[PDB]
Structure formats: structure tokens, C-alpha cells
Design a protein around this ligand. Structure first.
Ligand code: ATP
Length: 1182
């Protein structure tokens, strides 16, 4: 959808309504300013044509004909040169006003939008945030606001310019003779038609492509997330073929786009060369009959094509304006939306002497994300002033909902909530929340100082009072131990505070507010019994004589409360003191007892990647020379035409010369269509090969890498799918397409420099001296349009980061009632990109003005100097046109080439990354073929003094002097405090990493000397969260022993021994059932048993079990443990043990602490040791 145009320019002050008006009048002038440059150019050839044939045919006088005609041209061209400079003078003024006033008026409007849009979001309801996706909302603050500034800025001034030329151009064409124009305007619908057809066919082969690679690029994403399972089971080649057998689809489809894109080029490049002749063949016949002059035609043919091409230059300026209307709809809706609970209004009462009488009356309530089911039904309950009320009951009974209604974050439907006899929906929201202290489940700390985070509760508090509150909250002594005490910087940027310390800050914040009512919703939940005790002392302190509602999770909180309400299904089944509810032996009694990147890759290296198809490259080079030569050809055939009618000739030859040269256009026009159809058929396949061949070599080379690579923060599973998907394809704009450019550019400017130099060399050294100037200008505009894009958009990140901090914790700030503070913080940050943008339009006023002025001025500096060369009989007027339209129309050709081809800079660095991902050789070559691979199936495992550090964060040491044997067929349990040391042993026997020092042996043999495939083939990885692949049960299981004959019989025996056979045989589509996200979702317990079943098929001599049972499925757990006892029997086993019961039946236990084996032995010996191991078993008991 979109907005009405006249709405969208609201918030535009009267001065912005003026700037947009004055700037338009500039745009209209600048629009017609080039049609005038074509009209004069016509009247200039008339001045040359009138004398060009006098001095040649009849030799009447030698020096009385020289001065006669030549002092006429010298006086005619004084005016034509004064006329040209007059335009560029007016342009210089006009062009400034155009882009100045429009970017200004847009900027002035944006700054008024940002504040009104953010404030609109801080003014919304809390049920408003429930329905909406907050992620896209935050980007909508800086993307959609960035999408509007396009379609109200300078993009309008260019539109009214193009329309003033469309009508300004078709005006001049018609008044200078109507026959020539209606010829063209009969063909321009054929070209306005020809343009849109291909864009329907290019858009066709686009969306078909994103669904072609979506098959291949889906296998890619699944692997690189599941890389731990792929390497550990050696399926690194099986995944290469799946990714490849779907990779031919997007290739063949890539060719139908590659051909048809260069068809679209040469097809429309033909209809120009066709309609050139049709308009010139017919245009020459109207000067031969002495109806038009040569100056008349050359005006009209150009003055039409400019005005006719003015539509295609205004295509995107509309699309940017319609994108701006559309993005402006989602925003303006929010600004004009007004809430029922207005957090900014000043309406309700502000009652004083609030004792805290609390009353709920017949409350019913439904959330608006799931409104089908009611959450609370007929809920009634009073809290007497200064008493504490604990809410208990099972999950889903609206305990927090109660607290949300007393915050008034939703408005109940039926019933009434009153404070001291007064409807809470009849006082003001800010006074309400000012009297209420919110202790959330999780405390939000803001990325600011501790002083400010506390002062957020009440911005006028003195530093004396801060000290008092921090004391009362029990957070002072820990603050006294921090290095930057009350100035320490907290949040995501700063030092991470513990859970206990964060909550006490939230408590101090609420104390600063000194409210009359306190609300706590799981104040202590996550916190351990040690952290909880300090908070409880500080909570209890803060409550002393305040009316309190606490969502209680800990039994000790509930036992000392003055009154308990028991909730069940929205309904208070029993209310009383602690002893009553215990006496009742209802719901409450049951609860309380049970609980007890800048790589400089070279152009030559990239080119070598496509070297396997050099014959394709030779042809494309060849046609890139012809097509680069057709431009300077046209500069002749245009000149040689006009030469006849401007230098001298008999009207017997004006027919054959004109029609010949007029049909040499269609010689050129055909050769245009052929050389493009062939250029994009050889360089086209050369690219679509190159993508497909590099995605393979990459994805192959990616699975070759070792685990330290995939552990890095930069090589995440997404940034590799991107790198594997578009960066792999973006290379082809730097192999063949770069030769096509430079061979075109050489064959164009090369052969065009040569020709113009011989026909007259004086004019050329001027033009090829000035082309350097105007060529520079198109770059610095592209630079400073972009170099300024960073500056203005970098100063916005602070302005955007402020908003990000406020939306991401909206439920908090609204409870602190600091919606205004963050609004002000946003606005104050926005004052920098405002004042920068008000200088930006001043800048782009100039870069746009002095581009067109140095072009309109330099248009005079050529046809003045070139004219004096005809006075002095040094060059003909034909030879001027043969210089001018051989440099200029040829220099414009490289731009029309370079702007079509892919962004070369963006392609080289996009390619430089590909070469690095290919040329990288790992520390652990999984692909290799050497290694001992004996027939000795003992599996004696031995770690001796292994020392290892994670190379993601090598500053952290884990293991020091770790030495240990596992005897054949024994089970070894790893235990100790939480740490990565225990997990590391599994990764080293896998050989996912090498160790720094020490030695890992397998049956007396160094694992660095055994093939990585045959080390890992006899090792079973049982992951925490086992990865199940989108695939059949046979394939997910076959992932274990790959490249193997496995039939139906061998599958069933293994599934028995994992204990899943009986459950499998009654399910629908039994062994064929699709599992994954598309298929039946398996529980946590079932997935792990699949991982066990996969390990049984492999039948290894060693079993690595790592943190298995990472789920809560109670029955499955005993099923897993049964299946596990089966899987271990008479096998050498290494278990990372977290559960005490697993440890009891193990043959040997190792207690590890800080890299050090403090003790080890059988179960019985470690208990009687009465050491570390003893401590673990004792804590669970009591
Ligand atoms: N963002 C949300 N949008 C809509 N409804 C929600 C949202 N969050 C929670 N709910 C609803 O709140 C209802 C009651 O949950 P409640 O917050 O009372 O749990 P609780 O009592 O706090 O339990 P616990 O303390 O264990 O989380 C649920 O039925 C759930 O649908």
C-alpha cells in the first residue's frame, strides 16, 4: 500500500513549502536548458553550411573571399559562444538552487519525523508491543526513515527536471518542423514497448534463480551449523555431492539469464541504430528538397531524443518516490495512533496520602496475542494497607498478570481495580507508576554509568541520597570494591555484573523512586541460594512498612508472609496464613513438602580461475573489440553525412552519400546485435561455469578446514552461506566482463583517439585535456556522495543506539516512566546529523552545479576553438564533428559500458575472500589418505601430560599436565567442576584440535601418525543436542559408517540395540518417516537415542559420551540409560559424567580441577578418600 501524495508532505513548514517551490523553478529551467543547447547547435551548422560551400566550388576571390566569409563566421560564432556561456552561467546559479532547496526541505522534514516517530513508539500500549515484531520495528526507525529521505530530497528536483525536458524537448522538436518528429514518435512507442518487455523477462529469470539455488543453499546451511557432526562421522564427502547434485540447476538457469540479458542489450542497441537510419534517411530527404536546413534536422533529431530519453531517466526517481510513499505508510500509522492508556497525558487525579488499600473486583482478562482463551476469570482479592501478599499456584494462573494489571500495563475487560476506593483507570498513569516500584524477573541495566542507571528512577536526586539508597539496597560494599566506583560503566559495553549485583541495582533504583506500593515478579528465581540470601535481606529491608505484592518462587519467602493467596485456574481456591493452608492440606500443602576484511587480490590471479575456458575468452575479446569499434565508426558516419550538407558538394551526390552512410547505420546496427549476442554467449557461460566451479571448490575446501576455523566468530554458519552463495557468484564481473570492458574501452578510445588526431590534432589536445577534467568530476561526485554517506550515517548510530536501548527494554522504561528521557536523549543526539545535513545540501548544491557548468561552459570552449580552426582554413566543419562526436560520444560510451557492468571493486574483494577460503590448507587435513591404519583392534587409550588452549581465545589456559590411561574394555568417567577441560578430552581423541604439548597415544601409537578418518571412524560422538538431519531415518543413521553397502538387515539389528526398534515398528510410514522440521518433530529424548543408534552401527572399540541427557524427559532418561548400558557393554568407554548415578557403575573415575587430576579411582575408593569427589555426592543428599 501507499500514502496519498498530499498527506506525505505534512510536517513541511511554510519555509519548506517555499524551498520546494523555488527549487522546482530551478529544476524547470535546468530541464529546458539542454534543449536550448541543441537549438543553438542547429543554428550553428546553418552559419557554417551557408559559407561552407561558397569558398570551395567557385574561386571568385582569394583574399576578398577569405575576409568576407571568415569575418562573418568570426562574428557569428561570437554570438553562439556568448549564447552557450549564458546557459552555463544560468545553470551554475540554477543547479545550485535546485538541489540546495530540495535536500534542505527534505532534511528539515526528516528531523521533524524522527522525533515524532520515536515519541509515537514510546507512547504506545504494552499490548501494542505484544502483537508486533520488535526486531523489524527498530530497523524501521532508521531504514524506513532512510527510505523516505530519498523520495523527498533531490530525487524530486531531478524529476521535475526530466518532465520539463520531456515537454520542453517535444515542444522544440515540433515547432522546428513536424514531419521529422512524428516519424520518431511513431517509433518511440516501439522502444518504450521494447524497454519494458525485457524487464519483465529479466525479472522472470531472477526469482526463478533464487529458488534454484535455494535447494543447494539449504544443504549448505544445514552442514555448516552441523559441522561438529559431519567431521566426527567423516561425511565430509557425502555432503559435497548433495550440495553439488543440486548445483547444476542454478547453472542452466543462470545461462538463460546470461544470454537473454545480452539479447536485451543488443536488441535495444539495434533499435537505436535502426531508428537512427530511419530518422536520418528520412531527415536527409527533407533537406535535399530544401524544406529543412541541416541545422533544423540536427536540432529536432537531438531535441526529440533528449526529451524522449527523459522518461527513462525519470523511471527510478518515481520508483524512489513511490517507495517513499510506501515506507511512509507503516510509519505515519503509528504517529496518528493514540492509546487508551496514554503514558504522556495529564488527565487523571493525583491523589495524596495514599495508604495502599488494594482491591481486585471480578477481574477477567485476556491477552491480545491469544485472545481465544481467557487467562483470568472472576478473580477477587483485597490486600490491606502495609500487608504483604504472596501469590502461589501452578504455571499459567496469571500471577504476573496480576502485577501487570496493577502497573496498568493492560486494561482488564470485566471488573474493576481500585486503589483507596478509586478506580486505577481514573488516576494519571505517571502518578500511578511513580507510586509503584517494579522489581522485574530479570533486571535491565542500561549502558550508562551506575549513577545514571540509578538516577533513571528520578532524574533530580542528589548524590547524598544515592549513597543512602545503595546502602539500604545492600549494594554499597560491592560498589566500594569496584575500580571506578559510582562512575563505573555498566551495561553491554562495560564490566559484566553478577546476577546478584544487577538485581540490587534494580532495588536501589526502586528505593530512589520511594514508592508507596511495591511489586515484585520473581525477584529471585535464577539466583542461587547464596546470591538469593543477600537480595532477600535487602528486599525485606525495602518492604518494611510498604504494601507489597510478591510473585514468590522460594518457599522461605512465602512462610514469613502475612497472607497467602492460592490461585488455580484464575480462581482463588483458598486464602489464609501459612498455617491455615498447611492445615487445609490442599494445593499449597503439596507444593511446600515435595520441594523440601581488506585483501588485495590481483586482477591476474582472479583471471586464472576461468583459465580452463580460454576459447570462450578469445571470442569474447574479439567481439569486445568490434563492439568497441562500432562507436567511432558511427562518429564518422554521422560526420560524413553532415559533412556533405556543411562542407560543399553537388546535389547529384547528396543522394548516394547520405543513403549509403544512412544505411551504414544498419550495417553497424546489425553488427551491434551480433557482437552482443556472441559476447554474452561466450563470456556468459564463462561466468556461469565459474560460479558453479568455485562453489564446489569452496565448499570442498570448507569441509577440509579443522574445527578451530568453524569456532572463530567470523566464520559463522551464515556468513559462510553468504560467502558460498553470492560472493562465489560475484567474481564473474572481474574475469571476462573486465576484459570485455577494457577491450571495448581500448577499441573505442584507442581507434577514436587515432582518427581525431589525423583529421585535426589541435582540437583533440584540447578535448583530451578537458576530458580529464570532466571525467574526474563524475568520480568525486560518486565519491563524495558516498564518502558523505558514511559520515551522516555514522553520526546516526549513536542516535540509533539510544533508541535501540529504549525499545529493547520497553517494558522496563515504561515502568520507570522515563519515556520522555530517552526521547530527549534521542533528540539531543540527532542535532549533529541535522546541522551536517544542512551543510550537505550546500555541498551537493555545488558538486551538481559545477558538473553541469563545466560541461555547458566546456561545450563553448570546444565549438569556439573548433570554429576558429575553420576561419583559418586549418580544418573543415565536417572534421570538427568528426573530432567532437568521436571523442565525446565515444567517451560517453565507456560510461554507458562501465555503469552497466558489475561493480568491479565490489567484485574483486568479493573474489579475494573466495581465494582465501580455497587456498587455505588446514592443520588437520581430513581429506588426506596417509596414516597407519593397522589391524590392531585393542584400543588402549592414553593421555600423557596433554596441554591445550583454545585458539579462539588462547589467552584462557584450560589444561596443565593431564596424564591418564584407559584400559581396554573399561569405562572411564570424567568429573569435576564446570569447565571445558572435561569436554576437551573428547575433542582431542577425535583430533578436532592438536595439543600444544604432551602426547595423546592410541594403542601405543601417536594419533598425529594415524589417518584422521581411521582415528575418527572408530570413535563415536554422542553430542549434547544431537543433530538430526532433514532426511530419511536410513540416511541420518547411515551418516555413521559412510561409503558402505548397508542393507535392511544391518539397519534393524542396530535399532534393536539402541532400544528403539519396538517403538519404530508401530509408527506410520515406519522406517520411511521423514524426520526434521517438515516431518514429525521428535522429543529431546528420542533424538539422543538416534545418536546412540548411529554409534552402534559403526561398532567402534571406543565410545565417547559427552554431556548426554541434556533434556528433562523423565521416562526417556531411564530409557536412554538402559540403551546406554547396552551400548557400552564390553567396550572401552569414555563418559563425560554430570549425573552422579552414571558415575557409580563406572570402572574408573577421574576428578579434574583446573587442568589437574586431583584424584582418581573406583567409586568406593574416591568416597573413602573423602576429598573432592566426596563433596559432590554429599551435596545432593541433604
Ligand atoms: N508476550 C505475551 N503475549 C501474550 N501472552 C503472554 C505473553 N507472555 C505471557 N503470556 C500469557 O500469560 C499467561 C499466564 O502466564 P504467567 O505470566 O501468569 O505465568 P507465571 O504465573 O509467571 O508462571 P512462571 O512464574 O512460572 O513464569 C499465559 O497463559 C501466557 O499465554
Amino acid at each position: 500500500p501507499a500514502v496519498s501524495v498530499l498527506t506525505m508532505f505534512r510536517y513541511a513548514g511554510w519555509l519548506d513549502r517555499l524551498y520546494m517551490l523555488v527549487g522546482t523553478l530551478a529544476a524547470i529551467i535546468h530541464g529546458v536548458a539542454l534543449p536550448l543547447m541543441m537549438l543553438i547547435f542547429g543554428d550553428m551548422t546553418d552559419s557554417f553550411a551557408s559559407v561552407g560551400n561558397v569558398s570551395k566550388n567557385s574561386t571568385n576571390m582569394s583574399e576578398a573571399d577569405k575576409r568576407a566569409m571568415f569575418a562573418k563566421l568570426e562574428e557569428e560564432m561570437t554570438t553562439y559562444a556568448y549564447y552557450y556561456t549564458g546557459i552555463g552561467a544560468g545553470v551554475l546559479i540554477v543547479a545550485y538552487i535546485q538541489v540546495s532547496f530540495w535536500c534542505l526541505a527534505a532534511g528539515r522534514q526528516i528531523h521533524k519525523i524522527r522525533q515524532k516517530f520515536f515519541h509515537a513508539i514510546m507512547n504506545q500500549e504494552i499490548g501494542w508491543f505484544d502483537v508486533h515484531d520488535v526486531g523489524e520495528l527498530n530497523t524501521r526507525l532508521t531504514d524506513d526513515v532512510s527510505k523516505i529521505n530519498e523520495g523527498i530530497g533531490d530525487k524530486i528536483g531531478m524529476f521535475f527536471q526530466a518532465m520539463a525536458t520531456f515537454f520542453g524537448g517535444f515542444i522544440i522538436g515540433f515547432t522546428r518542423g513536424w514531419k521529422l518528429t512524428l516519424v520518431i514518435l511513431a517509433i518511440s512507442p516501439v522502444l518504450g514497448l521494447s524497454a519494458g518487455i525485457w524487464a519483465k523477462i529479466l525479472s522472470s529469470f531472477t526469482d526463478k534463480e533464487l529458488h534454484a539455488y535455494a535447494k543447494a543453499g539449504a544443504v549448505a546451511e544445514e552442514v555448516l551449523a552441523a559441522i561438529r557432526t559431519v567431521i566426527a562421522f567423516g561425511g565430509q564427502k557425502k555432503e559435497l555431492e548433495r550440495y553439488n547434485n543440486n548445483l547444476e540447476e542454478a547453472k542452466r538457469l543462470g545461462i538463460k539469464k546470461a544470454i537473454t540479458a545480452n539479447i536485451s542489450m543488443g536488441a535495444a542497441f539495434l533499435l537505436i541504430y535502426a531508428s537512427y537510419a530511419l530518422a536520418f534517411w528520412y531527415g536527409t530527404s527533407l533537406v535535399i528538397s530544401k524544406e529543412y536546413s541541416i541545422g533544423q534536422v540536427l536540432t529536432v533529431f537531438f531535441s526529440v531524443l533528449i526529451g524522449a530519453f527523459s522518461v527513462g531517466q525519470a523511471s527510478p526517481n518515481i520508483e524512489a518516490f513511490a517507495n517513499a510513499r510506501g515506507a511512509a505508510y507503516e510509519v505515519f500509522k503509528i504517529i496518528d495512533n493514540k492509546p487508551s492508556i496514554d503514558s504522556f497525558s495529564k488527565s487523571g487525579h493525583k491523589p495524596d496520602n495514599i495508604q495502599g488499600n488494594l482491591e481486585f473486583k471480578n477481574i477477567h482478562f485476556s491477552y491480545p496475542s491469544r485472545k481465544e482463551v481467557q487467562i483470568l476469570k472472576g478473580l477477587n482479592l483485597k490486600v490491606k494497607s502495609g500487608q504483604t501478599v504472596a501469590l502461589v499456584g501452578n504455571s499459567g494462573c496469571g500471577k504476573s498478570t496480576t502485577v501487570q494489571l496493577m502497573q496498568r500495563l493492560y486494561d482488564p475487560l470485566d471488573g474493576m481495580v481500585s486503589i483507596d476506593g478509586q478506580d486505577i483507570r481514573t488516576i494519571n498513569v505517571r502518578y500511578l507508576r511513580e507510586i509503584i516500584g517494579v522489581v522485574s524477573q530479570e533486571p535491565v541495566l542500561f549502558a550508562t554509568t551506575i549513577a545514571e542507571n540509578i538516577r533513571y528512577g528520578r532524574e533530580d536526586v542528589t548524590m547524598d541520597e544515592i549513597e543512602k539508597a545503595v546502602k539500604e539496597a545492600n549494594a554499597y560494599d560491592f560498589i566500594m570494591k569496584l575500580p571506578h566506583q559510582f562512575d563505573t560503566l555498566v551495561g553491554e559495553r562495560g564490566a559484566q555484573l553478577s546476577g546478584g549485583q544487577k538485581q540490587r541495582i534494580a532495588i536501589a533504583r526502586a528505593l530512589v523512586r520511594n514508592p508507596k506500593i511495591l511489586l515484585l515478579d520473581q525477584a529471585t528465581s535464577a539466583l542461587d541460594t547464596e546470591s538469593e540470601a543477600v537480595v532477600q535481606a535487602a528486599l525485606d529491608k525495602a518492604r518494611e512498612g510498604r504494601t507489597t505484592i510478591v510473585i514468590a518462587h522460594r518457599l522461605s519467602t512465602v512462610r514469613n508472609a502475612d497472607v497467602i493467596a492460592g490461585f488455580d485456574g484464575g480462581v482463588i481456591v483458598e486464602q489464609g496464613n501459612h498455617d491455615e493452608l498447611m492445615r487445609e492440606k490442599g494445593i499449597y500443602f503439596k507444593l511446600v513438602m515435595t520441594q523440601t576484511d581488506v585483501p588485495p587480490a590481483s586482477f591476474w590471479r582472479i583471471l586464472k580461475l576461468n583459465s580452463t575456458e580460454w576459447p570462450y575468452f578469445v571470442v569474447g575479446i574479439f567481439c569486445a573489440i568490434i563492439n568497441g569499434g562500432l562507436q567511432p565508426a558511427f562518429s564518422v558516419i554521422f560526420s560524413k553525412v553532415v559533412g556533405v550538407f556543411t562542407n560543399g558538394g553537388p546535389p547529384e551526390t547528396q543522394r548516394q552519400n547520405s543513403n549509403l552512410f544512412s544505411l551504414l547505420f544498419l550495417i553497424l546496427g546489425i553488427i551491434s546485435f551480433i557482437t552482443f549476442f556472441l559476447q554474452g554467449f561466450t563470456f556468459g557461460k564463462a561466468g556461469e561455469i565459474l560460479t558453479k566451479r568455485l562453489r564446489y571448490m569452496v565448499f570442498k575446501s570448507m569441509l577440509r578446514q579443522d574445527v578451530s576455523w568453524f569456532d572463530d566468530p567470523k566464520n559463522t554458519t551464515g556468513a559462510l552461506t553468504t560467502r558460498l552463495a553470492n560472493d562465489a557468484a560475484q567474481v564473474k564481473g572481474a574475469t571476462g566482463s573486465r576484459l570485455a570492458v577494457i577491450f571495448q574501452n581500448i577499441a573505442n578510445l584507442g581507434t577514436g583517439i587515432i582518427i581525431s588526431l589525423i583529421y585535426g590534432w589541435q582540437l583533440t589536445l584540447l578535448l583530451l585535456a578537458i576530458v580529464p577534467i570532466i571525467a574526474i568530476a563524475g568520480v568525486v561526485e560518486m565519491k563524495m556522495l558516498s564518502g558523505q554517506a558514511l559520515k551522516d550515517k555514522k553520526e546516526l548510530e549513536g542516535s540509533g543506539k539510544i533508541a535501540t536501548e529504549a525499545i529493547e527494554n520497553f517494558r522496563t522504561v515504561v515502568s520507570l516512566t522515563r519515556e520522555q528521557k530517552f526521547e530527549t536523549m534521542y533528540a539531543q543526539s540527532l542535532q549533529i546529523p541535522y546541522r551536517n545535513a544542512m551543510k550537505k545540501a550546500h555541498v551537493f548544491g555545488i558538486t551538481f552545479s559545477f558538473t553541469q557548468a563545466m560541461m555547458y561552459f566546456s561545450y563553448a570552449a570546444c565549438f569556439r576553438f573548433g570554429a576558429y580552426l575553420v576561419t583559418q582554413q586549418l580544418m573543415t566543419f565536417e572534421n570538427v564533428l568528426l573530432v567532437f562526436s568521436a571523442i565525446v560520444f565515444g567517451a560517453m560510451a565507456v560510461g554507458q559500458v562501465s555503469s552497466f557492468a558489475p561493480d568491479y571493486a565490489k567484485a574483486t574483494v568479493s573474489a579475494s575472500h573466495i581465494i582465501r577460503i580455497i587456498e587455505k590448507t588446514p592443520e588437520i587435513d581430513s581429506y588426506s589418505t596417509q596414516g597407519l591404519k593397522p589391524n590392531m583392534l585393542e584400543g588402549n587409550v592414553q593421555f600423557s601430560g596433554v596441554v591445550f588452549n583454545y585458539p579462539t581465545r588462547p589467552s584462557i589456559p584450560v589444561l596443565q599436565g593431564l596424564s591418564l590411561e584407559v584400559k581396554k574394555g573399561q569405562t572411564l568417567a570424567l568429573v569435576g567442576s564446570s569447565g571445558c577441560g572435561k569436554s576437551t578430552v573428547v575433542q582431542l581423541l577425535e583430533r578436532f584440535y592438536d595439543p600444544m604439548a604432551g602426547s595423546v597415544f592410541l594403542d601405543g601409537k601417536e594419533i598425529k601418525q594415524l589417518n584422521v578418518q581411521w582415528l575418527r571412524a572408530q570413535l563415536g560422538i554422542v553430542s549434547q543436542e544431537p543433530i538430526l538431519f532433514d532426511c530419511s531415518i536410513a540416511e541420518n543413521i547411515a551418516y555413521g559408517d559412510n561409503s558402505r553397502v548397508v542393507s535392511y538387515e544391518e539397519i534393524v539389528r542396530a535399532a534393536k540395540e539402541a532400544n528403539i526398534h519396538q517403538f519404530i515398528d508401530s509408527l506410520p510410514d515406519k522406517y520411511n518417516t521423514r524426520v526434521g522440521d517438515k516431518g514429525t518433530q521428535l522429543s529431546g529424548g528420542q533424538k539422543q537415542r538416534i545418536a546412540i543408534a548411529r554409534a552402534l552401527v559403526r561398532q567402534p572399540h571406543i565410545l565417547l559420551l559427552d554431556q548426554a541427557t541434556s533434556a528433562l524427559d523423565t521416562e526417556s532418561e531411564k530409557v536412554v540409560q538402559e540403551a546406554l548400558d547396552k551400548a557400552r557393554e564390553g567396550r572401552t568407554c569414555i563418559v563425560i559424567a554430570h549425573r552422579l548415578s552414571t558415575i557409580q557403575n563406572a570402572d574408573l573415575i577421574v576428578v579434574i580441577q583446573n587442568g589437574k587430576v586431583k584424584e582418581h579411582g573406583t567409586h568406593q575408593q574416591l568416597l573413602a578418600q573423602k576429598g573432592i569427589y566426596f563433596s559432590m555426592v554429599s551435596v545432593q543428599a541433604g
